[PDB]
Design a protein around this ligand. Structure first.
Ligand SMILES: [Cl-]
Ligand SMILES: [Cl-]
Ligand SMILES: [Cl-]
Ligand SMILES: [Cl-]
Ligand SMILES: [Cl-]
Ligand SMILES: [Zn+2]
Lengths: 260, 76
């Protein structure tokens, strides 16, 4: 089991990212190679200091709350000017996450992948192939057979306003951490089928941010024993161990592949 | 005036001409009318930042040929 932030001031859109950050093995490896004065160093050190407290009555819990809330508040205040929110506002991790990554260039590099949007209209000839570099791409109305190796979705054609052409993301260079956002979730929720190899390295879904009831974000973490940890900040500071994956397929909001 | 491009996550791109000091509410509503979307269901983002309907291009320092990103509103 593991510790997590408690809900307050509608900050689940930030808690879900923070929970996702502390359980990434690649990030933890990067932060301990760097050499101090990092926002991510402060985040993971305060998190482990809090998780060791949980491993060990009420006095212990206020210290944990203080360690997690201190670094959460620092991150929120850092995100506030660009994201333009007032404390207590609702917001989206799709917007907050890349702004969060830009706080440390050495950490953002772990997430920056290169790809190309490949498009070819079947009604008329309009066609393009555009290279991009992103840390979080949004997919909407994906084809049912959607796979990272066949990352296609339905879209209109800008030349003839025909609907149901297909735009496809062709991965070109995948970072050690690879994240995607799905407006309507994934076609199905057996996450093992969304594992993929790319240039010799296996990528598996290690964590997922769930979007429940169109009003609340919750983080799911894959542990070593195959079990899962549900970090619903509404369910207080502790987390919950689940025997198997549980988010409804339509509530899979952000998917994080790792394992480089 | 000024020219702006409105790009949705489905790949669509719509051009708009707008005055530098008029609030983006008229722009937002017209894009919704073209794509058949509801103002309550979408969000606009520029240069990584969320935009309110009261915002103007001059207040956000938008230049010509800039691009506005459209997202279906999915907050919490
Ligand atoms: Cl404030
Ligand atoms: Cl295609
Ligand atoms: Cl299923
Ligand atoms: Cl859209
Ligand atoms: Cl900004
Ligand atoms: Zn066409």
């Amino acid at each position: 089991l593991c510790v997590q932030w408690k809900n307050a001031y509608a900050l689940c859109w930030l808690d879900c990212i923070l929970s996702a950050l502390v359980h990434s093995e690649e990030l933890k490896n990067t932060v301990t190679g760097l050499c101090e004065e990092s926002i991510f160093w402060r985040l993971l050190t305060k998190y482990n200091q809090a998780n060791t407290l949980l491993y060990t009555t009420s006095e212990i819990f206020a210290e944990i709350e203080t360690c997690l809330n201190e670094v959460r508040d620092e991150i929120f205040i850092s995100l506030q000017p660009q994201l333009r929110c007032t404390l207590g506002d609702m917001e989206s991790p799709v917007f907050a996450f890349p702004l969060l990554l830009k706080l440390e260039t050495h950490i953002e590099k772990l997430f920056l992948y290169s790809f190309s949007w490949d498009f070819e209209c079947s009604q008329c000839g309009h066609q393009y192939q555009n290279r991009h570099m992103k840390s979080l791409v949004t997919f909407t109305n994906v084809i049912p057979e959607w796979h990272p190796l066949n990352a296609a979705h339905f879209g209109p054609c800008n030349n003839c306003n025909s609907k149901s052409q297909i735009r496809k993301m062709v991965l070109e260079k995948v970072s050690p951490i690879f994240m995607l956002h799905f407006v309507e979730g994934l076609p199905q929720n057996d996450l093992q089928h969304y594992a993929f190899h790319f240039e010799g390295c296996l990528y598996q879904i290690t964590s997922v941010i769930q979007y429940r009831a169109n009003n609340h974000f919750i983080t799911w973490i894959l542990d070593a024993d195959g079990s899962w940890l549900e970090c619903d900040d509404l369910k207080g500071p502790c987390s919950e161990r689940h025997k198997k994956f549980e988010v409804p397929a339509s509530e899979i909001h952000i998917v994080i592949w790792e394992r480089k | 005036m000024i020219n702006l491009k409105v790009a949705g996550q489905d790949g669509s791109v719509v051009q708009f001409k707008i005055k530098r000091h008029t609030p983006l509410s008229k722009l937002m509503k017209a894009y919704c009318e073209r794509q058949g979307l509801s103002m309550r269901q979408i969000r606009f983002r520029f240069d990584g930042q969320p935009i309110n309907e009261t915002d103007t291009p001059a207040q956000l320092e938008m230049e010509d040929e800039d691009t506005i990103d459209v997202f279906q509103q999915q907050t919490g």
